[PDB]
Coordinates of C-alpha atoms in Angstrom, one line a residue:
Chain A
X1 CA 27.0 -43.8 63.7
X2 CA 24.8 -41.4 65.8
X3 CA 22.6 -38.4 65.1
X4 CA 25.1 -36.5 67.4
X5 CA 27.8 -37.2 64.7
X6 CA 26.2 -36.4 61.8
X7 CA 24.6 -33.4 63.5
X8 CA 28.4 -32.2 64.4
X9 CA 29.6 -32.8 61.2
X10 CA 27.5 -31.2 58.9
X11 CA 27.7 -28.4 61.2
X12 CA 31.5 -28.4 61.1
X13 CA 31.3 -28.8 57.5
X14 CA 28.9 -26.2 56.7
X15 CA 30.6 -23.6 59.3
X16 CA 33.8 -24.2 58.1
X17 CA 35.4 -25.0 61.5
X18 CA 37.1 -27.9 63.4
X19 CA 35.1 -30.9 64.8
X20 CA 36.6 -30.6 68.2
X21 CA 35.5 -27.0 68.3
X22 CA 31.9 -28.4 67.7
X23 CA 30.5 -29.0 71.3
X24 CA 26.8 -29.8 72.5
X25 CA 27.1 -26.2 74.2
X26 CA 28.9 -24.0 71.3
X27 CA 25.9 -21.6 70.0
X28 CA 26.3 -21.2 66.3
X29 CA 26.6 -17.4 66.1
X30 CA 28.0 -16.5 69.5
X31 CA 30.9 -19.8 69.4
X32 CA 31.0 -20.8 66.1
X33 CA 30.9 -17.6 64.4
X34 CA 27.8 -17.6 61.9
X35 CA 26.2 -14.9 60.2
X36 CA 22.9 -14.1 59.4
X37 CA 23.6 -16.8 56.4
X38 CA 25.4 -19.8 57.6
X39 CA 21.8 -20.2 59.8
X40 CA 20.1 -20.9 56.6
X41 CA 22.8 -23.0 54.6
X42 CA 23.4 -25.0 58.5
X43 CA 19.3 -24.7 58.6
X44 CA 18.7 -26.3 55.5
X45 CA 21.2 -28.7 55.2
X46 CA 20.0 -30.7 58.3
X47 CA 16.5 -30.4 56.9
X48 CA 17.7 -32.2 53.6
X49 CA 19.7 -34.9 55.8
X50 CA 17.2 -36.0 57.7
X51 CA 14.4 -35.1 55.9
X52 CA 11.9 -32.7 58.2
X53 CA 11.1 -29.1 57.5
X54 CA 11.3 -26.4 60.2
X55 CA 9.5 -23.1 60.4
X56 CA 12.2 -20.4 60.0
X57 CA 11.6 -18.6 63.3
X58 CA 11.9 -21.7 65.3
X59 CA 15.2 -22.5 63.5
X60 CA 16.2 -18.7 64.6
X61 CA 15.1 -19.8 68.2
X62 CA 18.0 -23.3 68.1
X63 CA 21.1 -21.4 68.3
X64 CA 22.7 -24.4 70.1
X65 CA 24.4 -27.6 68.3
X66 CA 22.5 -29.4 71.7
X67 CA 19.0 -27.1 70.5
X68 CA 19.6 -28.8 66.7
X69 CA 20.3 -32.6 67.6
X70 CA 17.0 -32.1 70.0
X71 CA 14.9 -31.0 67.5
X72 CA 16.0 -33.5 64.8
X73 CA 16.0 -36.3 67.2
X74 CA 12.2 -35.2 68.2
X75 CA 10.8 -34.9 64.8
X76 CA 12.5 -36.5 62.4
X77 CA 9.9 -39.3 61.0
Chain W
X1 CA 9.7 12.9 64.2
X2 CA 12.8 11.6 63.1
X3 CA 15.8 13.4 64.7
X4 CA 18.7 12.1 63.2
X5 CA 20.0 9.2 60.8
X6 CA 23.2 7.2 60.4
X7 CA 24.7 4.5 59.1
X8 CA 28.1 2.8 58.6
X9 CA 30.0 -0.1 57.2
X10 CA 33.0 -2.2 58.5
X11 CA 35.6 -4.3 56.5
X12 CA 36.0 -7.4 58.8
X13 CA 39.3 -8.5 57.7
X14 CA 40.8 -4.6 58.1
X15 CA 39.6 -5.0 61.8
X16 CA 41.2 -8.4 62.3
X17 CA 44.3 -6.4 61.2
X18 CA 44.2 -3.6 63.3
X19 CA 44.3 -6.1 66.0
X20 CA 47.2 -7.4 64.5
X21 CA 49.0 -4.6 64.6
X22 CA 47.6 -2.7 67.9
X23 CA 46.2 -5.3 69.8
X24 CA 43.4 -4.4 72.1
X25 CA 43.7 -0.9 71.8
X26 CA 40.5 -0.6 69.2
X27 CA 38.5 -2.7 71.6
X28 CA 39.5 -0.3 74.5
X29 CA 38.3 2.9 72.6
X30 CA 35.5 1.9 71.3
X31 CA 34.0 -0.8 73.8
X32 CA 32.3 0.6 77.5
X33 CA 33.3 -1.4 80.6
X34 CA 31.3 -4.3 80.1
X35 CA 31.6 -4.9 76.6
X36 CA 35.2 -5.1 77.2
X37 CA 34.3 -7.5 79.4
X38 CA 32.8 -9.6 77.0
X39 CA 35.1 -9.2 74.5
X40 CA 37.9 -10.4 76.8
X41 CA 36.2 -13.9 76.7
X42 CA 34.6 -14.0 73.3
X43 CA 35.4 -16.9 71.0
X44 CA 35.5 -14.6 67.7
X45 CA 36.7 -11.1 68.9
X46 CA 36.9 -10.0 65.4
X47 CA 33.5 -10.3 64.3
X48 CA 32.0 -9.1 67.7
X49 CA 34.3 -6.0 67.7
X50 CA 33.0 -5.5 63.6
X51 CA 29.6 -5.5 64.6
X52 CA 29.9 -3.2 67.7
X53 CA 32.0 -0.7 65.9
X54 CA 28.9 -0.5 62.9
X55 CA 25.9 0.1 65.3
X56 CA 28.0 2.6 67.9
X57 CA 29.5 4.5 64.6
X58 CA 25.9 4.9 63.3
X59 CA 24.8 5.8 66.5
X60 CA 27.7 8.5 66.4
X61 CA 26.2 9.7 63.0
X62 CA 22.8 9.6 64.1
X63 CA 23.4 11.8 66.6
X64 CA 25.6 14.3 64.9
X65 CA 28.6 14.7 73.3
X66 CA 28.9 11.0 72.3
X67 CA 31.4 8.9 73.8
X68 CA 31.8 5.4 72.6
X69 CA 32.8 5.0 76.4
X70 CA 29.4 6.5 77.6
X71 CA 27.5 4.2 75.4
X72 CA 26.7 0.0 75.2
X73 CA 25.1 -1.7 73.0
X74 CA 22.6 -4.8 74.0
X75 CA 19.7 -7.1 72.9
X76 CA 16.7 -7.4 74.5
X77 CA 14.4 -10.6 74.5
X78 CA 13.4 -10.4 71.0
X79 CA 17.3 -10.5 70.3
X80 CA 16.6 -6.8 68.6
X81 CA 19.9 -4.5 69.3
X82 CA 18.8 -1.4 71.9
X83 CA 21.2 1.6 73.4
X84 CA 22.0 2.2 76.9
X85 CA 23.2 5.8 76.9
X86 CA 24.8 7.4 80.0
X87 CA 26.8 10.1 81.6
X88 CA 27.2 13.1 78.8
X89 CA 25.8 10.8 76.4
X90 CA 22.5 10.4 78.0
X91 CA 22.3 14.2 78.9
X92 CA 22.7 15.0 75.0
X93 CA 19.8 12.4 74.6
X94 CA 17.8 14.0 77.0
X95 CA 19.0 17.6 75.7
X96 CA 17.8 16.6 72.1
X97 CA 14.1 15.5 73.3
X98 CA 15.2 11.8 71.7
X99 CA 11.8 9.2 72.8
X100 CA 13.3 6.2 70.5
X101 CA 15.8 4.5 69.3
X102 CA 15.7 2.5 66.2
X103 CA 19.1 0.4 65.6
X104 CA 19.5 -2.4 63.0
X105 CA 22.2 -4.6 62.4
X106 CA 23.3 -7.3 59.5
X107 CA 27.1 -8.9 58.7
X108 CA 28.1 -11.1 55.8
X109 CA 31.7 -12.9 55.9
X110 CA 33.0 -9.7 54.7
X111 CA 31.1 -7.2 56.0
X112 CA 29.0 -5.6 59.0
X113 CA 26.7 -3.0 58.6
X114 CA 24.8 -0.9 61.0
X115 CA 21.8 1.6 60.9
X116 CA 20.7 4.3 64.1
X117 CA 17.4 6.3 63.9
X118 CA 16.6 8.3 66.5
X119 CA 13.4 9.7 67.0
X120 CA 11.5 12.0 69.0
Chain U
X1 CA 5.7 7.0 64.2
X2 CA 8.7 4.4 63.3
X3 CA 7.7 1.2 64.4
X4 CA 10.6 -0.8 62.9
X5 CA 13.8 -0.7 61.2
X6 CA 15.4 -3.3 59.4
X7 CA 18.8 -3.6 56.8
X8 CA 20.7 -6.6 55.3
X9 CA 23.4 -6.7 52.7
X10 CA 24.0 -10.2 50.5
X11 CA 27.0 -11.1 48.7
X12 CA 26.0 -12.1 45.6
X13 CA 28.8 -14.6 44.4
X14 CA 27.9 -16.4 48.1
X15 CA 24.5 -17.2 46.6
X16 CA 25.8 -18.4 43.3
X17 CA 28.1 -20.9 45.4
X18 CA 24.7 -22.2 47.4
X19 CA 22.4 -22.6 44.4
X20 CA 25.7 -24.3 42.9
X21 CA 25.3 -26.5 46.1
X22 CA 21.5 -27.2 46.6
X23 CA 19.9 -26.3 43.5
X24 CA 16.4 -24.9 44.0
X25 CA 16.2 -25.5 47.6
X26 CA 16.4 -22.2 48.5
X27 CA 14.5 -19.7 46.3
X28 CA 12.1 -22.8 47.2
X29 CA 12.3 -21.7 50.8
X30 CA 12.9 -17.8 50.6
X31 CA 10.3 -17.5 48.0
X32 CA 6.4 -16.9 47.7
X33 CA 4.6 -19.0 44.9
X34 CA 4.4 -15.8 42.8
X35 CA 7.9 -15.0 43.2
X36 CA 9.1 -18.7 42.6
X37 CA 7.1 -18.7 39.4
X38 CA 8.9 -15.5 38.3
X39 CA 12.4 -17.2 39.7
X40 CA 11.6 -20.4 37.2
X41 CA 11.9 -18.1 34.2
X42 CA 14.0 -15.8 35.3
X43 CA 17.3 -15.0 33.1
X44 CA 19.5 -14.5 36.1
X45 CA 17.9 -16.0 38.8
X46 CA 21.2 -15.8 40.8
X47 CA 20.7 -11.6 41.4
X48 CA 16.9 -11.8 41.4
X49 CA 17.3 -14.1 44.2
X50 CA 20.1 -11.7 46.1
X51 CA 17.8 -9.0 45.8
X52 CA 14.3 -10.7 47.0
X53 CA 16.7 -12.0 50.3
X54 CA 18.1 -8.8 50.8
X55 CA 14.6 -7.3 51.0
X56 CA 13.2 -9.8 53.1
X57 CA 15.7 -10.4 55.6
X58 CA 15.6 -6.3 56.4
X59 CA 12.2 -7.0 56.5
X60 CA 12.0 -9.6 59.2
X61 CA 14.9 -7.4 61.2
X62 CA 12.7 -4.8 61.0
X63 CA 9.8 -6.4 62.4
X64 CA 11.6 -7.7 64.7
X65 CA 5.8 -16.3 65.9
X66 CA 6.2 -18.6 63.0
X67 CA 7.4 -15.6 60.9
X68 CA 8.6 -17.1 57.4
X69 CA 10.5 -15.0 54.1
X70 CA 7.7 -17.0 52.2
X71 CA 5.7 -14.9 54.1
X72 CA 6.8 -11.6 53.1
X73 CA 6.4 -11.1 49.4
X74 CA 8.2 -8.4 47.1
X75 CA 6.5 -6.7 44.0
X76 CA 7.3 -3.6 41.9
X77 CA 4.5 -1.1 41.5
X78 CA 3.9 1.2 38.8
X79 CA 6.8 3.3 39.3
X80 CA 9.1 0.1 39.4
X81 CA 9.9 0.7 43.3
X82 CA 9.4 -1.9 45.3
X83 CA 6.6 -2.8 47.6
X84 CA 5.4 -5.4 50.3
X85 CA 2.7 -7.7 50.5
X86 CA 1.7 -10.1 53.6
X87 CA 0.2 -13.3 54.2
X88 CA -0.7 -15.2 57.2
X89 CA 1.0 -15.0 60.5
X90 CA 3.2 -11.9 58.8
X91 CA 0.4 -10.2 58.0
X92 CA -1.2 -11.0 61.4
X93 CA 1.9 -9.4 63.2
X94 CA 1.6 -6.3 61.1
X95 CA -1.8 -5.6 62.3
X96 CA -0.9 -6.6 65.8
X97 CA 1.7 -3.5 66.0
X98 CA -0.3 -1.0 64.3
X99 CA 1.6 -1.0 60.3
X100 CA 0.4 1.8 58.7
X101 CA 3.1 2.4 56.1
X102 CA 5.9 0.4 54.9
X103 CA 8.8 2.0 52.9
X104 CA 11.4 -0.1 51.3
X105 CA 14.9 0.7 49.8
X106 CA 16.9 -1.3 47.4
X107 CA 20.3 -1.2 45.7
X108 CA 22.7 -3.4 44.1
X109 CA 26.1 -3.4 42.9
X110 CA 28.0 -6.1 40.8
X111 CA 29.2 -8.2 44.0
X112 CA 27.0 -7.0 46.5
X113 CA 22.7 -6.2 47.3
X114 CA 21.5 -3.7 50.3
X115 CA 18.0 -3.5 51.2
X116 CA 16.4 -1.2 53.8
X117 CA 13.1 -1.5 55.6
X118 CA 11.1 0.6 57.9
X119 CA 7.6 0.3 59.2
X120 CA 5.7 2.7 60.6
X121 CA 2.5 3.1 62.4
Chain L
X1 CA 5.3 11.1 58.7
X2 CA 8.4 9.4 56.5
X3 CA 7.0 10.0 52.9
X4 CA 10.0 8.4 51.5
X5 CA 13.4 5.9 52.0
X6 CA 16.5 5.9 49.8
X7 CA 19.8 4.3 50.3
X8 CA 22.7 3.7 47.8
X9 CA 26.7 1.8 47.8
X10 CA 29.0 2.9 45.8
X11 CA 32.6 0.8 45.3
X12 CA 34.9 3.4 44.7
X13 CA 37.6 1.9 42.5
X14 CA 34.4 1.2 40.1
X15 CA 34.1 4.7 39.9
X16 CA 38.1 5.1 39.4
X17 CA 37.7 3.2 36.4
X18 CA 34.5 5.1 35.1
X19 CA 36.7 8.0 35.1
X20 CA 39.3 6.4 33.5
X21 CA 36.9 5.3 30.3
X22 CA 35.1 8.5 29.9
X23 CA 36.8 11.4 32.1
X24 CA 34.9 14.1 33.1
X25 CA 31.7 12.7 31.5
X26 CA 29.8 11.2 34.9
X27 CA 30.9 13.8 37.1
X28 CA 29.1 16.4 34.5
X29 CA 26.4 14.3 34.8
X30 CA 25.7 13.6 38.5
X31 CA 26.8 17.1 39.8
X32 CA 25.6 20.2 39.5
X33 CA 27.0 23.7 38.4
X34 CA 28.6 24.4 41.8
X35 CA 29.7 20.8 42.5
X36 CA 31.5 20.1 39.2
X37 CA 33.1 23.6 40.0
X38 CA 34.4 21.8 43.0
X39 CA 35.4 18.3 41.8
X40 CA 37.6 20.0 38.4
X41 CA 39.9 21.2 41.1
X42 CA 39.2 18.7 43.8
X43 CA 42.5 16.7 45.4
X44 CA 40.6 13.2 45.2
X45 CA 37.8 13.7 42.8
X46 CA 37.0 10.0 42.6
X47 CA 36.1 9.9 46.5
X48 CA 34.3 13.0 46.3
X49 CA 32.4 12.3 43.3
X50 CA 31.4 8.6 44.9
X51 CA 29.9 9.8 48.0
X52 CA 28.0 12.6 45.9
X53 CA 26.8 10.3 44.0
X54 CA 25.7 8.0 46.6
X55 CA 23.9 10.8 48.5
X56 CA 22.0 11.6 45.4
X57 CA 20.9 8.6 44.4
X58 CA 19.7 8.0 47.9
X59 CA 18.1 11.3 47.6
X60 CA 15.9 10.3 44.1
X61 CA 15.4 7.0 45.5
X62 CA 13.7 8.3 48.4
X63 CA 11.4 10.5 45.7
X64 CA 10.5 7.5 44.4
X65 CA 7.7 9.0 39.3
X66 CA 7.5 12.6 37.3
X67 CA 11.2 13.4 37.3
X68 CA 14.1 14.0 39.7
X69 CA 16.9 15.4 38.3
X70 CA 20.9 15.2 39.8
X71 CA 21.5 18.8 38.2
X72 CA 18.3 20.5 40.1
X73 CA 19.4 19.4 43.7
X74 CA 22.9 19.6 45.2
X75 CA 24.7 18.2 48.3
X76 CA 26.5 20.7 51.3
X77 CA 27.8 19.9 54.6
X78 CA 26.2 22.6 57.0
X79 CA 28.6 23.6 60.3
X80 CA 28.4 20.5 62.0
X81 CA 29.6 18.3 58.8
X82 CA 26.6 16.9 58.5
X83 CA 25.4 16.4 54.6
X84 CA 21.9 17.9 53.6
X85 CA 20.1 18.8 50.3
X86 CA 19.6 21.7 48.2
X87 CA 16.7 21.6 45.8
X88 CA 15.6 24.2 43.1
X89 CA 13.7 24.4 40.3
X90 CA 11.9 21.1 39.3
X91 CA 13.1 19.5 42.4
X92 CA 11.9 22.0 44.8
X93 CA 8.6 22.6 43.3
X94 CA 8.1 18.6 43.3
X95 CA 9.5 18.5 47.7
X96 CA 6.6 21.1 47.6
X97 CA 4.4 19.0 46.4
X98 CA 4.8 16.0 48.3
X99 CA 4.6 18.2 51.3
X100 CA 8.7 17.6 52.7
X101 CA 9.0 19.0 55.5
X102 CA 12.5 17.5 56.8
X103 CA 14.9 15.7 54.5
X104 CA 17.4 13.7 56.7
X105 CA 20.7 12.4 55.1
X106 CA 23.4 10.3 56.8
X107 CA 27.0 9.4 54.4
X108 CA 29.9 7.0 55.3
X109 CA 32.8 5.7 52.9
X110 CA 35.4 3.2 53.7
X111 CA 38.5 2.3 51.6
X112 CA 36.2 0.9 49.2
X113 CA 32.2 1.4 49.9
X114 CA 30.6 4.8 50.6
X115 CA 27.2 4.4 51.2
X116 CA 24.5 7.2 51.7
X117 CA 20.7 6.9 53.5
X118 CA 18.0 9.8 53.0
X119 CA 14.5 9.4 54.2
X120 CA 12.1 12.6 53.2
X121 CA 9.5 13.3 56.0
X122 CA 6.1 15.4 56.5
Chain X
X1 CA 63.8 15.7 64.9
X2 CA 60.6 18.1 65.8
X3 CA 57.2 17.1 66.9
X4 CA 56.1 18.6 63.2
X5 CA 58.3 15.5 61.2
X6 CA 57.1 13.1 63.2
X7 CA 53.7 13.6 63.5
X8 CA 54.0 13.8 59.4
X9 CA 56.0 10.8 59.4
X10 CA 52.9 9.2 60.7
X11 CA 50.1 10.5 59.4
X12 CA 52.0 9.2 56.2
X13 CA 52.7 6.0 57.3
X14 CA 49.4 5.4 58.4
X15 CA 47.2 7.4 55.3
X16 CA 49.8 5.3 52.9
X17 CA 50.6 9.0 51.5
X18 CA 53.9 10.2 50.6
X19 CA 55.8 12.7 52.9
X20 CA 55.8 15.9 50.3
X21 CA 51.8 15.4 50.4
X22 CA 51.4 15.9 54.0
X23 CA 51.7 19.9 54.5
X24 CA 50.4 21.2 57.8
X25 CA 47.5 22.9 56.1
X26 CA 46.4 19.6 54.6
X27 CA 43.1 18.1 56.0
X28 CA 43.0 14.6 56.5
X29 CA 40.0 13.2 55.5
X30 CA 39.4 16.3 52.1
X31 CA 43.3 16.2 51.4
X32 CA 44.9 13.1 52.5
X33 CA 41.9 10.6 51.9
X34 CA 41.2 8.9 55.1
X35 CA 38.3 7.1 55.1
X36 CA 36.1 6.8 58.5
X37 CA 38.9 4.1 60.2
X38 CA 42.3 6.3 59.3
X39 CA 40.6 8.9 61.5
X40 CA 41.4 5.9 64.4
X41 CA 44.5 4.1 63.5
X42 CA 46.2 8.0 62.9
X43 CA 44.6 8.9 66.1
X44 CA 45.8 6.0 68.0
X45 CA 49.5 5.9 66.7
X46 CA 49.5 9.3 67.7
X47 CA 48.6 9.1 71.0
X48 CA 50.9 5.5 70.9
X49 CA 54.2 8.0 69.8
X50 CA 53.7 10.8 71.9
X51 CA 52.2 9.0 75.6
X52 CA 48.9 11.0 75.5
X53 CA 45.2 10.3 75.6
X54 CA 42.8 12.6 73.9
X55 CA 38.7 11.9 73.8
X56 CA 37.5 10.5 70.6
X57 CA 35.2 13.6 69.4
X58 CA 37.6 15.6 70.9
X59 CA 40.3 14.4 68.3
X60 CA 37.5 14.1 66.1
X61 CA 37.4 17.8 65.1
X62 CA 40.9 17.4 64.7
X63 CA 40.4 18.0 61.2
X64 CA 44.3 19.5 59.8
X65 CA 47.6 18.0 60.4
X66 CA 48.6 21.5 61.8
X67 CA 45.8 20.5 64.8
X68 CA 47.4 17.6 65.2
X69 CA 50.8 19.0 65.5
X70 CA 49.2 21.3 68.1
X71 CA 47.2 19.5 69.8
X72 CA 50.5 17.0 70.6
X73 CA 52.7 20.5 71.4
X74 CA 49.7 21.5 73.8
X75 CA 49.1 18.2 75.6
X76 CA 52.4 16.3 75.7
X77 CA 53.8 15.0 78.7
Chain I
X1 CA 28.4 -0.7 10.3
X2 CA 24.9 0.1 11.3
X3 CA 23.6 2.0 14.3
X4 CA 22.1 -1.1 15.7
X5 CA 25.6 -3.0 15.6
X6 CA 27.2 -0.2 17.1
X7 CA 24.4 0.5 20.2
X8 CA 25.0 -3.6 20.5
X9 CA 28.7 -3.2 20.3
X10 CA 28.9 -0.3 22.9
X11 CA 25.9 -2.4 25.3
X12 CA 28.2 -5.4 25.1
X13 CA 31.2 -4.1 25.6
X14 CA 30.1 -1.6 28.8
X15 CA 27.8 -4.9 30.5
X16 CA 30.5 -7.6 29.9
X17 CA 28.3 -9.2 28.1
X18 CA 28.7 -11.5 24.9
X19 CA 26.9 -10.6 21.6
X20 CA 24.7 -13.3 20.5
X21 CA 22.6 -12.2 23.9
X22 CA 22.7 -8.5 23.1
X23 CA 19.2 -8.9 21.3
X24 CA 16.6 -6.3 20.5
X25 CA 14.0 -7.3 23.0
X26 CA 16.5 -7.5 25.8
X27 CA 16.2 -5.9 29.1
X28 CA 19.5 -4.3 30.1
X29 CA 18.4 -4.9 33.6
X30 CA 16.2 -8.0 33.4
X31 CA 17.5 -9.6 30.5
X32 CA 21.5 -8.3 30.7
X33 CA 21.9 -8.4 34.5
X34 CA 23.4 -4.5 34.9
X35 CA 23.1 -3.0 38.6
X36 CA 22.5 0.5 39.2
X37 CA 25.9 1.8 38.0
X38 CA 26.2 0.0 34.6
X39 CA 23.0 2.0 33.5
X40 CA 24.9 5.0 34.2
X41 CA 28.1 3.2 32.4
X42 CA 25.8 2.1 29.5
X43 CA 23.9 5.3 28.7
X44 CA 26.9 8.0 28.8
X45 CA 29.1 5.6 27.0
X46 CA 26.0 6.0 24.2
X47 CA 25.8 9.5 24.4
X48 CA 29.8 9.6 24.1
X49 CA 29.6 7.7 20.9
X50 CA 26.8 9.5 19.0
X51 CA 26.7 12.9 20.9
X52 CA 23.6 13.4 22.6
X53 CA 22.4 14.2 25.6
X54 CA 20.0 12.3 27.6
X55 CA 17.5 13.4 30.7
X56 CA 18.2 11.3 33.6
X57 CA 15.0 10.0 34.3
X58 CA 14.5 9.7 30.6
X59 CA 17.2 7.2 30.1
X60 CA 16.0 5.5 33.2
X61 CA 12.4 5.0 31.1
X62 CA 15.3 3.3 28.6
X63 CA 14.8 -0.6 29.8
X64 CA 15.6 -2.4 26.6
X65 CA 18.5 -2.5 23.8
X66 CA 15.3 -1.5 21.4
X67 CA 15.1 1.6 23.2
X68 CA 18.5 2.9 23.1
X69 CA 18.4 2.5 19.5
X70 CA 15.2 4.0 19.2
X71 CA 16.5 7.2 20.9
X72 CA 19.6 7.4 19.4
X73 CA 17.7 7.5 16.0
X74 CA 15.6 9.6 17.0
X75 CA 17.8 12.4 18.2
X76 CA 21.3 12.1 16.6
X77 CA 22.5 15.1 15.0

């Protein structure tokens, strides 16, 4: 598979930390401990998955794992 | 009019060992009542205490009277950092004619780093 | 008259790893045309590409929608210090809040860039 | 009002090995008279000649070019242990030019960065 | 142990610093190198040792081991 | 060795940088890849080798490996 996994996943992967740890709820700075970088290797990792290209202050503005798996499941063509 | 200037930067890993060895005694210095509050709860202590320590240690600088206990650090709507000053703290704001407070804030995996103008 | 203040620091090894990853993805992203036609040439594109980041990010901090680093732009002048120039909804924003001047700082070391921003009115 | 921004880092054990290549060389270089009087007798001269040096080169960045020299404008703390700048000669005739009114100056080291911020004003 | 050979016990201990180096006229950030943090771990062990609080600026013009030493004498309880 | 072997040598040497890219035309900052400090490195190792002094913001002006030489020819005594 689902967009949910893959979305978890490359998070986990990118972020360095454990898949349980990666809920729909856990924000990416304030509970999975990014910096002001892991947003753009996280950011632009989805948008080579799945293909779709996001303007950087709306990527700023998804700070959620839910927030990320919305906006990929809305635009992703 | 720029009134004063300050900066500062924090090791993250030397933090997480301080709270090796000490516990929570950093984070009861250097954090007010409700950012102790928060970092009770917080999922990465380390880093949040790291960044807190940068802005509130340039703020220190900048003014050159302030407490770390009479001071909190929080961000507004545009997710900006801002001061809330207090107590003697405030009064050595108010005593200095300060109008503004300019506070920026940046952390790597290493490293957090702060900057505090104030301004009249 | 400070309207804004804005600082980043970048670890320059950290970039080597994600252009090791992704290639030319992001100087493709982070980059202007001008500046990604200098990056294609450039002998160490690795640093140049530290440094522009760390310029822009304490840019955007120091600004504070649609806001993107392609949007900020990094040149030296005659003097070699740096200088900004804006496009589009960057450029918008800085009239919106009044920039009269903007004065950049840069510095970096073998393992690590700083950049410092402020705008003022 | 600003008329100019500076900031430096310095990594401190980069400077311990400076010193260990070529001695006394950069610290005759970055300081002037009275400051190298002070580092030849100085109990950690490489900590003291890094944040000098930061300060400084926050200080000519923030100049921005005619000439700035290190050995025209030194660095003193004041009562408070705040840092500010001394200019003569060159230096001061070129603050007088640009029309500084304030210089502002803000140091920090750690165990292994010091870094320095000066921003000149009108 | 006197209040003087521990308090230099520590300082030591926390500065890394040998003992013969840490003489009561000795400053500790000009003489004994502490960066911005010693200033807070020596600080904090002291008031840890010797059961006493003292405000941060207040300890912060504590610039001497010889202040220190007197400040603990003065305060102590 | 000559004087250009040896600037080369010393430029080398002080950027970590191998010799076959040490060329005349190089930048030491856009062409070797030296930060702030390794000008400093760079240029007083020079003036240790062949004795001569420098101004600051003249040996800033002093971007390429053709320039070093240049001065050093022109002012070794």
């Amino acid at each position: 598979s689902t967009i949910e996994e893959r979305v978890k996943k490359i998070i986990g992967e990118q972020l360095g930390v454990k898949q349980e740890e990666v809920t729909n709820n856990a924000s990416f700075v304030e509970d999975l401990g990014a910096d002001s970088l892991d947003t753009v290797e996280l950011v632009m990792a989805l948008e080579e998955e799945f293909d779709t290209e996001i303007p950087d202050e709306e990527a700023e503005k998804i700070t959620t794992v839910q927030a990320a798996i919305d906006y990929i499941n809305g635009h992703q063509a | 009019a720029i009134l004063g200037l300050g900066t500062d930067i924090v090791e993250i890993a030397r933090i997480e060992a301080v709270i090796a060895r000490s516990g929570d005694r950093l984070a009861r210095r250097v954090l007010s009542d409700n950012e102790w509050a928060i970092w009770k709860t917080h999922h990465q202590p380390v880093r949040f205490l790291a960044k807190r320590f940068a802005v509130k240690e340039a703020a220190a600088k900048a003014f050159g009277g302030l407490a770390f206990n009479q001071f909190e650090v929080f961000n507004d709507e545009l997710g900006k950092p801002r001061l809330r000053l207090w107590g003697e703290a405030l009064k050595l704001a108010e005593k200095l004619g300060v109008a503004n407070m300019h506070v920026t804030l940046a952390d790597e995996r290493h490293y957090a780093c702060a900057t505090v103008i104030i301004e009249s």
